[PDB]
Symmetry: C4
Subunit: 218 residues, 4 copies
């Protein structure tokens, strides 16, 4: 019977049925953002969501019965477990994460996702350096401009936020630095080098990725 349960679990139709259920329920959560739709079919849609979640729970149970410890050493299975647990109870909205199951159920999506994920270890150094950079400048900015510009630099977290904004170049001058220089005429001395460093590091992060990809092909 154990072998029968695993033959049922590992069959192409079992997973195809899962995928079809995921697609239907994604359509449902789309329709659910509509207020008038919920006035007509809110009952039936809530019902459909309840039955979908119980199905996914019973199926996770069966998949655990098939692989005892293998389930919890598997990043994809750990992900499916954790999203269905989240949904089993901000949390109301967080239920929508169960749609990322399409990634773990469809092999094409797994292929591309783990490709992306495997790019990450090679960036671990340049991230740390940039974090340190951000951290240091955040401190400086909070001390240089927090008292007079409390909403952008008044705390370390505000300074982090604004520095991130400056790095994306989003209104860095007309919205942050020119207003500063009305009070601190030499604030560009802080922000131009920052932008320079931040851009140069970003560029190298990208070039590194490219070369590492080439290295695994050649």
């Amino acid at each position: 019977m154990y072998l029968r349960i695993t033959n049922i679990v590992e069959s192409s139709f079992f997973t195809k049925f899962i995928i079809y259920l995921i697609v239907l329920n994604g359509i449902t959560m789309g329709l659910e953002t509509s207020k008038t739709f919920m006035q007509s079919f809110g009952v039936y849609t809530t019902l459909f969501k309840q039955i979908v979640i119980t199905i996914f729970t019973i199926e996770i149970i069966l998949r655990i019965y098939v692989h005892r410890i293998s389930f919890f050493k598997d990043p994809w299975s750990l992900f499916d477990f954790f999203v269905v647990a989240i949904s089993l109870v901000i949390l109301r909205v967080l239920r929508v994460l169960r749609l990322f199951r399409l990634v773990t159920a469809v092999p094409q999506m797994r292929k591309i996702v783990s490709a992306l994920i495997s790019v990450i270890p090679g960036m671990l150094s340049v991230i740390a350096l940039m974090t340190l950079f951000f951290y240091i400048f955040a401190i400086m900015a909070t001390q240089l401009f927090g008292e007079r510009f409390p909403e952008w630099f008044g705390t370390l977290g505000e300074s982090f936020y604004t520095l991130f904004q400056v790095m994306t170049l989003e209104s860095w001058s007309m919205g942050i630095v020119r207003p500063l220089m009305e009070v601190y005429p030499y604030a560009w001395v802080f922000f131009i080098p920052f932008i320079f460093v931040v851009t140069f590091v970003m560029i190298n992060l990208v070039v590194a990725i490219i070369v590492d990809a080439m290295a695994i092909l050649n």
Copy 2:
């Protein structure tokens, strides 16, 4: 006579004449955006456009007489057919699409266009993942901020639009997220990871393209 009609259709001067006609008519549609020009020569320009379209129709007819089914299995010919059909009747403006005939008539333009087009199949996976990502976050954003920010997140389509805007980094913070945090102090928890994921995926989309190009050269 069939062979005579195909010798006429496939000649360098037939296509050169088509190209010259396309260029003249593009000049005409440029001049047509001018109101005072239309006050002096509007009649003659409308006349010229009418005769151009009948010529392109008669020539599509001849090209069909030359290739029976080959015409409709050919992406370039399918394109020429569909644009001249559009123009044969928002539709008034859509007539201007007939200028993309310069691409299908000039071989250099075909070369570069199909180069671009052939880059696309290799991106098909990363597009799907990003779409799913957008779709999920659109739902969440609509539930988190639709009621209080109806013009940016009130519907799924509005949320898609604003999320796309955030991905291009166009006023993401001074125009969207800081206004949000005046009400939802922790909205950055939603948008920073979003930007992070969206940027990282874009970068990999680009690096993939680069390596695939290298793979077809080496």
Copy 3:
């Protein structure tokens, strides 16, 4: 004497002296943007500029005496000729172009400039396609939104300008498309595909450059 004049013209000290003169005169044009500096030394600076230009003219004359037709088949010499001619008379400001002589006089600068220039022929196709794209969309935009939005789409040139702005993503939505959709609710149908095409083409332009560079190295 001809050989003596060419030995004088082609000597390392002749060009070193030119380079030193260029640097001094660039310093001068920097100091000249200052109004109070011009109140104290405006006379001497104008004098210095006059003598610099006569020197460059006499030296172009000598260089012509050395190479009769070679001078006018040489892109660098053609450039030096044309800038000194511009300065020999908006034109007041255009005199400042003579500082690009540092590029033609210093070999390192020539190396890098012609590297950049030689990247250009390989882009000639993708530029033409994008131009055609811009031209077509400019026409459409002028017809779709010129009457109601005269300052951004009222003419073909205005539409070109605004489309270029949208391509750089500079306020594309908060400043152009959301204001449009207050009147034309479906204007995103025009602008999102535009951005998509424009970005994709830009990306391929860049990837092409990269691969072409690799092709000349391998």
Copy 4:
């Protein structure tokens, strides 16, 4: 004893202790940006910072005793020396730079930092050209628009700042060039080519980096 002092200085535990001290003191400078934290523990935190700096001084002294001239021919040691000297006395805030010691103390951080630094010599040409470009256009912009737009082009430094802003595409049109064209209708003639050149040069700077990286791998 000299050999004993160098055995103490070069030991893994000496550097591990330095690294732990750096991390603790970074935590401290983070906590120090908080005003209420300083009301409760400001005394103890200032005390901790004092003892940290004396420790780093005594340790730099020992490291000098170990390597006489080697210390001052070493870029990392020169950096540690210069930051601790800065902190030994705007300067109040500049003390925070001592956190970049984590880079010089951790080998992973040294690896990635010198990787970045070694990318730089290959860019030295394209930087100079771009600087010259900026300098020339700064002069022109100051003469074309300084009198009427004193806050953006009134001086050479203001023009540099605004040109840099335009290069990052940060409000280049809605904030700079459209306001200009209300007065100088043809100002786009200046700024579009500028953007074009500036973008093209940036792209080549990046492509160069990529190919140079490939050249050192193949």
